[PDB]
Amino acid sequence: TLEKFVDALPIPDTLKPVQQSKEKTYYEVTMEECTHQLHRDLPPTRLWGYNGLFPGPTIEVKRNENVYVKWMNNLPSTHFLPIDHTIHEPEVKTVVHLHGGVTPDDSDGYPEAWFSKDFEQTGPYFKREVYHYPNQQRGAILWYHDHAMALTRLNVYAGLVGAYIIHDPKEKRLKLPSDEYDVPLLITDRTINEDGSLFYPSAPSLPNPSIVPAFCGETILVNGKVWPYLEVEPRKYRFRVINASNTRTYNLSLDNGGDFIQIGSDGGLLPRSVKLNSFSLAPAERYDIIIDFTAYEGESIILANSAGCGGDVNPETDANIMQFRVTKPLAQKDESRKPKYLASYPNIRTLKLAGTQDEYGRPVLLLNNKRWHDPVTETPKVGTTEIWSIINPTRGTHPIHLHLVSFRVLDRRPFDIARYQESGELSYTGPAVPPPPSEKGWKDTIQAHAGEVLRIAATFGPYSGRYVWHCHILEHEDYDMMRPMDITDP
Ligand SMILES: [Cu+2]
Ligand SMILES: [Cu+2]
Ligand SMILES: [Cu+2]
Ligand SMILES: [Cu+2]
């Protein structure tokens, strides 16, 4: 296996605008086939990257900045990863979803709004080349990634992911670590062949290739490098932790026993910070955290992982994320702060997660037993608030993502799965459990654990139109755990 901690952590450059005035900002981003070395001891890997970079450039914007992005496809006309034609016209389709963006529906990256190279061919919902991000929303860690119909697991795995940070200037009074002490950590597990090429499985009378129900990579990367190290000064740092992996959930900790200070979730700052010894981070979740290296001068500290992916973690491989080396000399005094008080925050629908089987014996994962192409059923009225009760009788956790909105977690409550299985009866085996401090703020991707009913409260706005909701395990999303969502307007 590849030698851990021999490559420095890349920090993606911040994208510079093509045009910026006091009232509009214009970006252009091209998807390019490119080659990048993922580890000291590997030949360069063929990847698909935004602006030919992996991860894509970090986009930084201000709350309410009027932002436009022209996302362009400069990619080959055939894919280099295994395509399964049975889960359903150009072979390569792309569309960019700004995950967590409060976005009008024609700029949200609808799966059927894809386009091929140079917009030559476009899907049925294609409408515009330049996407509009009004950014009228809390400061927060967003990220952007491909969302093309039936291809999302492959296009993201190929490298099409990037960070997107909304800065709210009113938060600058909290004096949280900033500038070079504010670092995104995009975590992606991959399997890499001896020759440096990406491996993605082509099989689980099955079709060949065949989609797989889950992908667990052999190696962990952060910001596009295998098991990297980051030299840090002995002071406070802010890290924007993004799980950009297809399937893998991480459970992070520090091997010197230190704590994290969580300050933010998907939808922005928590109401109050939380000292944590460890945390779970499923696909597309983000943790905004502070690590205080002040008391750890000279130490090497491993960011460790304890969560299995198709088996227990391997102490020599996926038990490891990255290594901090507290050996950078202090440039200036640490003027940053770790406040404990961060922010002040002032119909019912029932949805069933379940899996069936297709004609080939493969599992198909479904929301409410509906296919993607079935007529829409989740149709809340713009401006209305709903409580969604998400019932999970399956064996595993599903990280559920609702587009457009962020939501509040009400509670989780266990139920007997065998009983529910047959009579369809919701017989609770314990009291509801309110969200921990980590989930007392705003979320947009939420772990619905096995054998539990999860309740969330969302207000559906400010925009109306056609959106989606789905599991963010991309191997589930593509087959077929995704549904349209119409926010209706009278
Ligand atoms: Cu996403
Ligand atoms: Cu999303
Ligand atoms: Cu799922
Ligand atoms: Cu989505």
UniProtKB/Swiss-Prot annotation:
Highly thermostable. Optimum temperature is 45 degrees Celsius for SGZ oxidation. Optimum temperature is 75 degrees Celsius with ABTS as substrate. The record marks D108, E477 as: Plays a crucial role in the protonation steps. Its EC number is 1.10.3.2, 1.3.3.5. Induction: Expression is switched on about four to five hours after the onset of sporulation, a time that corresponds approximately to the stage of spore coat synthesis and deposition. CDD domains: CuRO_1_BOD_CotA_like (cd13844), CuRO_2_CotA_like (cd13868), CuRO_3_CotA_like (cd13891). Changing E477D: 9-fold decrease in catalytic efficiency with ABTS as substrate. 26-fold decrease in catalytic efficiency with 2,6-DMP as substrate. Its cofactor is Cu(2+). Residues 44-80, 93-170, 227-305, 357-488 form the Plastocyanin-like domain. Inhibited by azide. GO terms for cellular component: outer membrane-bounded periplasmic space. Changing M481L: Loss of laccase activity. Mutant fails to develop the dark brown phenotype typical of the wild type strain. It catalyses: 4 hydroquinone + O2 = 4 benzosemiquinone + 2 H2O; 2 (4Z,15Z)-bilirubin IXalpha + O2 = 2 biliverdin IXalpha + 2 H2O. GO terms for biological process: sporulation resulting in formation of a cellular spore. When expressed on the surface of E.coli cells, CotA was shown to possess improved enzymatic properties, including higher thermal stability and stronger inhibitor tolerance. It has high enzymatic activity against three industrial dye types: an anthraquinone dye, Acid Blue 62, a triphenylmethane dye, Malachite Green, and an azo dye, Methyl Orange. It may help decrease the costs and simplify wastewater treatment, and therefore, surface-displayed CotA shows a great potential for industrial-scale dye decolorization. Optimum pH is 7 for SGZ and bilirubin oxidation. Optimum pH is about 4 for ditaurobilirubin oxidation. Optimum pH is below 3.0 for ABTS oxidation. Optimum pH is 8.0 for UB oxidation, whereas optimum pH for DB oxidation is 5.5. One of its GO terms (molecular function) is oxidoreductase activity. Monomer. Glu-477, located within the entrance channel of the trinuclear center, plays a key role in the protonation events that occur at the trinuclear center and in its stabilization, controlling therefore the binding of dioxygen and its further reduction. Asp-108, situated in the exit channel of the trinuclear center, and its hydrogen bond connectivity are highly relevant for the overall reactivity of the laccase but do not appear to play a critical structural role. Belongs to the multicopper oxidase family. This is Laccase. It comes from Bacillus subtilis (strain 168). The lineage of its organism: Bacteria, Bacillati, Bacillota, Bacilli, Bacillales.
